Amino acid sequence: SDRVAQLTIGNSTITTQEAANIIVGYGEWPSYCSDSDATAVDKPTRPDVSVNRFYTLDTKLWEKSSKGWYWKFPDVLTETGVFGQNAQFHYLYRSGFCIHVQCNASKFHQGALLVAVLPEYVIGSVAGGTGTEDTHPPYKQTQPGADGFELQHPYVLDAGIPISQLTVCPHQWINLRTNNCATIIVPYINALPFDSALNHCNFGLLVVPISPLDYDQGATPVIPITITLAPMCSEFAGLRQAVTQ
Amino acid sequence: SDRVAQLTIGNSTITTQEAANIIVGYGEWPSYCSDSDATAVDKPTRPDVSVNRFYTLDTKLWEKSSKGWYWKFPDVLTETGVFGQNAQFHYLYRSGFCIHVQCNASKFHQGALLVAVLPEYVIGSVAGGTGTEDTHPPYKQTQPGADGFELQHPYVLDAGIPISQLTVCPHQWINLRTNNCATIIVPYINALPFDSALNHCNFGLLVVPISPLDYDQGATPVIPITITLAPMCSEFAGLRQAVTQ
Amino acid sequence: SDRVAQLTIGNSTITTQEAANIIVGYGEWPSYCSDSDATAVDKPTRPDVSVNRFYTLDTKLWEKSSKGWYWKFPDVLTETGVFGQNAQFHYLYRSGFCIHVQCNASKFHQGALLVAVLPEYVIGSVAGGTGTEDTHPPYKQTQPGADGFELQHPYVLDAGIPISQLTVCPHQWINLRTNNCATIIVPYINALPFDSALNHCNFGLLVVPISPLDYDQGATPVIPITITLAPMCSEFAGLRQAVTQ
Amino acid sequence: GDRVADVIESSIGDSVSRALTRALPAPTGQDTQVSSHRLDTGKVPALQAAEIGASSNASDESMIETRCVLNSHSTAETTLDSFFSRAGLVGEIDLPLEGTTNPNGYANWDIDITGYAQMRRKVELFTYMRFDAEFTFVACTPTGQVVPQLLQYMFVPPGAPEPDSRESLAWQTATNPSVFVKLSDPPAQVSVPFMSPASAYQWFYDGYPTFGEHKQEKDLEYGACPNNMMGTFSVRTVGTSKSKYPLVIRIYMRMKHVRAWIPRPMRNQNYLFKANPNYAGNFIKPTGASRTAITTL
Amino acid sequence: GDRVADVIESSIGDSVSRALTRALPAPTGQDTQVSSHRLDTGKVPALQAAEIGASSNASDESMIETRCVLNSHSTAETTLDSFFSRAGLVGEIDLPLEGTTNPNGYANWDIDITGYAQMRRKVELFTYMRFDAEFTFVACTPTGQVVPQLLQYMFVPPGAPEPDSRESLAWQTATNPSVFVKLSDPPAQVSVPFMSPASAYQWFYDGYPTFGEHKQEKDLEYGACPNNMMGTFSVRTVGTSKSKYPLVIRIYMRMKHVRAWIPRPMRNQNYLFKANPNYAGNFIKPTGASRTAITTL
Amino acid sequence: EIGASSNASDESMIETRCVLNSHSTAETTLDSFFSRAGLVGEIDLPLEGTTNPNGYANWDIDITGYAQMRRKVELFTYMRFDAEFTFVACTPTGQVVPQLLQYMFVPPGAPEPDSRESLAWQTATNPSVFVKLSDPPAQVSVPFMSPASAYQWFYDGYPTFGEHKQEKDLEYGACPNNMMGTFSVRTVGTSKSKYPLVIRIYMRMKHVRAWIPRPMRNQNYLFKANPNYAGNFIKPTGASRTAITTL
Amino acid sequence: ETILEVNNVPTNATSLMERLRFPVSAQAGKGELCAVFRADPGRSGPWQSTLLGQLCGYYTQWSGSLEVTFMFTGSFMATGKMLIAYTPPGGPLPKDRATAMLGTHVIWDFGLQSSVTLVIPWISNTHYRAHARDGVFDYYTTGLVSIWYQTNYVVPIGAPNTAYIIALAAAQKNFTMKLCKDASDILQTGTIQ
């Protein structure tokens, strides 16, 4: 009975009492991050629990002709909030996460969603769509902002990625039999210890409806899905002034 | 031998080894601030040592015809830096201080300065200078910024304040016999426990040259005086979003 | 408090009581020199303390347009005094040293000198200056005598020696903040055990003003710098008659 | 568990306002006596210089000696904090039968120490204060005699509406008790405790007591707070028997339960409004008169 | 001292990557056997369903029973990680005497696994890797015979300038050792360790390996890093005796010291440049061919 | 230098941080392993030529071969090391031809051959190496036979007895007898080669032991260990800019 | 101890006698900039002029930073008030005292002691970077150091208004430097035969 959460900030909040349980990861111990291998030797700090709390970032709708969506991690909150300014003026970042997506369906509604968190994913961009003519994709698809971006082809994930072979990542189902909300757990993984928040892209989410949305005419056409995230025990290194360069 | 300081941030710093000693205050014990008497009952936090460090705010010159200057506390850093944004978006503030003013004179130079820290001082503004005609002082004397403001009459301090009766506050002398730099110690005092950083003004510094600057022609005409401050163990209450209202 | 010296010979002498301290070398033990590896097997002797005492050799001036000077070691005293005759008629020499250079500046004066002792230094001679035309340097630059010789180019040391990369040798500063006189410590080092005093040159001093001499017009233009040396516990081998060949 | 020790640098032991210095109490103290000239070391605290407390490396009194004085004065009851009140004129008001300054028949005055700066400035030498107060209203004739009329006193607690007529609702003042006094009874004598909204009365205070952005419109609230104050007092004649003589009152002021802080030095200039930092700059005069020479008068 | 306990909430015991969960080791384990049908409780682990591992409140197998199977297979040496290499064509290059593609007489090729995607894509199924490599250069005639000529191999370490002439300074390569080989000796066989600047080779990586703001000008560095790479290899003929026969080389590739991570699934499309996510969208075809019906072929 | 705090505080305003280490320094030494790729040099023995009218080539063995890469090693003065000489033979065109070649060594002190039939070929005290063009190319180790404790390059002296005059000045660097000898190459036997040949000389150093650090040289010589420099065209060790703030 | 001369801007032979200079004059004394210089010591120029820098110029990788200081040569009454400040990479050119405020460093003052020990810790997240070639890839900033005046170059009457000194730097145990590259610049018109 450890599927509880105490959350209250701003003016509203969301907590659960009899939700769809949780998913455990790696069966492991708590720890901080490696400190005695950086370029410099200065002592680290610990920002603690100053600002880490949940604000929803988008309530994505699900419709009859949903084609797929995703996000860029951690580009979602790198530009907004005191966390945004801290990430902008600070070079090194690391923290854990507890992803909680709210996904409810009514008695009338039937269907399921294909929500897959894909780490380390080199993003499959539009790249001109065809890509045979050298017209480079503009910046309006590299830094979309809080809106995310629309993925082109589901069963190849814009990169040749056949759908049935996505099973490697933590796989989740959205069904009124299964869950009133889904939980995703991911720690901090990178092939290199230290990097900037503007050059390197870690990964992003992915959502493609595994089942088409259907309902007899007379019901709600779209289904909103809410997402929020708050990193737990966040620590930032490369402490410096408010200087981008 | 506890007149030491370890300071390094940005690109430059200032520390002393054989300075003009220190001034002790009240012969007291360390402590946090009262917590069980606020309007709300939520638990407090502790920002710790995240950003508290010294950057100089101005290097004030001393000249032949110096008439006097001062500052507004804590209006000096309420608008600039991550401390500035924190103070803007946070309602309650409290911390200790260690004022260190750098004031050197050469072999050629003779003279002294009258630097007095005056707490709780209701500011004696220009108020039209004469004040007999109702032309209210503009905002260009309420929020001067990082430049401070120029005091009108020394021996009345713009409020009727005769000079010889300033002895109540910690009194300091600037002389090559006395000090290569001066130290001032002041804790947090207010007649009320909680207030905003934009409505209420706590106090400010005051500088009026006790002795006129003099030198035989052929030497430097002006004398720079440097000031920096960094609050120790700062704690902010009224934690909220980046919302002014 | 072992920075003392008892010196009295001839008619004048120089000792210090509150000088600029001393520089230690190699953290080592006293010892004589290797005896069981020479060409012959005859027993050695010990001249002891017969004549080792300080006479100044030159009081070098420092001026507005100083370009640099140096000396040849141990050519400075190889030709004068009873030590001179002993070195002339004796083939092998070895002793320790305690270099004490007197360098004072007044209240008016500002500046510094670049005095570097450079062991094993193959001398960078004039060699015709240009050196492209085969006109060999005369003997008036191989055996200058008690006057020393003038070095041509400071920042290459007449051999391509960039200045900032002289740091290898014991480095000293001449400043009224730093020293009223400088101390240099060097033992006897040679790549070969035994050599003559006329064929091989061990090393020499080097002086180039690190800072140009400056003063407001009306003060002394030149600054004298005094140098003396007296080898401690000198021992000479190859004992023979007064025969050069 | 207990593995990292990053936070242990703290200094638990909270006593007083925030600082970082430390001291320690001692059980007992030290004493000193007096002696004469002698060249000795070890124990010689006989004389005391407030700053130095010793002799410099250049002798101060090598030529002559000193003397001694004995004490016969007591300082037990020399404190002034509460007993410093003495004689002095205070002030008066009038309620005539026919007049123009009082077209309504009643007088409502805002209660405050800002009555008359002449003697209030003596008490206004401080800023933060906690004290008890006393109001005395003595009634007589404008000529200076006594007449048997029918008068009574109604109190106006803060927050009540200010009466605009002789028949206002403010006369009921349900939560205000009643005092049984009459002209035959001794004149008014009412105690006033400390009901400041803050810890002390605000005079030397730079702020904005009203919410919202500060503009030129909202500047009059300096000193004259419409609601933060402790109320006013209204005086009239109640009953069918209306007085046939005009009357005058004298108001007497006294302070008890002294507790002060924040020393603020003396003022040698004049104001023009309540707590107005404005001064007669064109006619500034020093706190004392000087002379062409100090040697002779 | 020790008064406040705000920070003591920490969980010292650092073991692995950041998280908040906790577990615990156990000394020994558990076992299970097989049995037949019986209605009993307490101990009944006989059958195992990977997810449920029990029986629902609606019976699954109430009508019939099951059977048993025995094992006779070994799995000790079935691992493929390093031994998965088998036969397959790899590639070749040519150094003719007279030609237009080689107007200089020497061939400098950039060393990488990006040689020929046909078989590299089999190894390119992963992203983060640590392995050893082997390069074999076998020399022969273009016709397929053998001729006694004079050849030798010079290595180009990374960071050295790329030769632009037959007499470049790059031939001295002071820090590069020398291998004593000749056409009589067996063909080239050189080991290549793991000198990646990072922990693994970067192919599926979205970033900017060059400092400064990212613009359209600086986009070609995807895959082809001018300096981050492990160098190239230059081949020519050294000496006064110049060869009178054209020659050809075949390049053989082999991998050792396997250590992999980050599984990445199979690709059914084609690229156009190195690590180019672009695909033939107008002609997308599924990974397998389907049929009009599944029942019959 | 100080290791304490002055009587005027240095860091009274802000605090510092900490850094952790994850790097190893066990095998980072360069003393012997600092050798990498680099072009070294070659020589030629043609059949018909004018630079070699005798048919044999005798070259004085030394590190003074080509200052380009030797100056990298010449950064020191007093040294004890092992050396290796590799002679690889091929055609001037770049091919291989089955000829008959062999290598004769010239120990120091032996007379320098002045003919194809000199007595120096007997070299009684010199052993023989069994090598042929079929065998792998030359690979000969050279130990440290310096007459002194180290090789003399930065040395001001007179290695010849007698009074020093203008006549005896050429011995700077080129010592006729103090050196470790030369090497002579020719073709022995009745079967004379019908192809011209070329050799490449490869250099490598082992058993490093050094002293006496001597800093870097930014100028050029004109003879062996010649302190003379192009004074009329002196240029700093690095290029500067009109301002340091911006490139 | 390694002598470092930063602003040897002049490029003339007659200036090759006085390269020690850094600008001191009748300054405005209002926080105006004296000199700035980026943190990287491994780039060609007067930076590799130092022996530490000369060795770093042959290397590709680097782990850590250096330690620096600067001397002073004023007279007894002569003094000054300068500003020594470092900024880690991530920002444009500094503007004024506020930028120094953003940068953590140690406040410096000319008192009796002349030396000013500025230690730059191991500020390096990555030990190596993606392989590319030279071009417009200057986006990879490395940091900066800024020098400032506060009051003026202050001396009494009768004292010359010039005092210029050279800097000093060295390396600590934390920094490591290897992966040697071959020679890039060496001058030889002829080779020894």
Automatic annotation (TrEMBL), chains A, B, C:
<comment type="function">
    <text>Capsid protein VP0: Component of immature procapsids, which is cleaved into capsid proteins VP4 and VP2 after maturation. Allows the capsid to remain inactive before the maturation step.</text>
</comment>
<comment type="similarity">
    <text>Belongs to the picornaviruses polyprotein family.</text>
</comment>
<comment type="subunit">
    <text>Interacts with capsid protein VP0 and capsid protein VP1 to form heterotrimeric protomers. Five protomers subsequently associate to form pentamers which serve as building blocks for the capsid. Interacts with capsid protein VP4 in the mature capsid. Interacts with protein 2C; this interaction may be important for virion morphogenesis.</text>
</comment>
<comment type="subunit">
    <text>Interacts with protein 3CD.</text>
</comment>
<comment type="function">
    <text>Protein 3A: Localizes the viral replication complex to the surface of membranous vesicles. It inhibits host cell endoplasmic reticulum-to-Golgi apparatus transport and causes the disassembly of the Golgi complex, possibly through GBF1 interaction. This would result in depletion of MHC, trail receptors and IFN receptors at the host cell surface.</text>
</comment>
<protein>
    <recommendedName>
        <fullName>Genome polyprotein</fullName>
    </recommendedName>
</protein>
Automatic annotation (TrEMBL), chain F:
<comment type="function">
    <text>Protein 3A: Localizes the viral replication complex to the surface of membranous vesicles. It inhibits host cell endoplasmic reticulum-to-Golgi apparatus transport and causes the disassembly of the Golgi complex, possibly through GBF1 interaction. This would result in depletion of MHC, trail receptors and IFN receptors at the host cell surface.</text>
</comment>
<comment type="similarity">
    <text>Belongs to the picornaviruses polyprotein family.</text>
</comment>
<comment type="function">
    <text>Capsid protein VP0: Component of immature procapsids, which is cleaved into capsid proteins VP4 and VP2 after maturation. Allows the capsid to remain inactive before the maturation step.</text>
</comment>
<protein>
    <recommendedName>
        <fullName>Genome polyprotein</fullName>
    </recommendedName>
</protein>
<comment type="subunit">
    <text>Interacts with capsid protein VP0 and capsid protein VP1 to form heterotrimeric protomers. Five protomers subsequently associate to form pentamers which serve as building blocks for the capsid. Interacts with capsid protein VP4 in the mature capsid. Interacts with protein 2C; this interaction may be important for virion morphogenesis.</text>
</comment>
<comment type="subunit">
    <text>Interacts with protein 3CD.</text>
</comment>
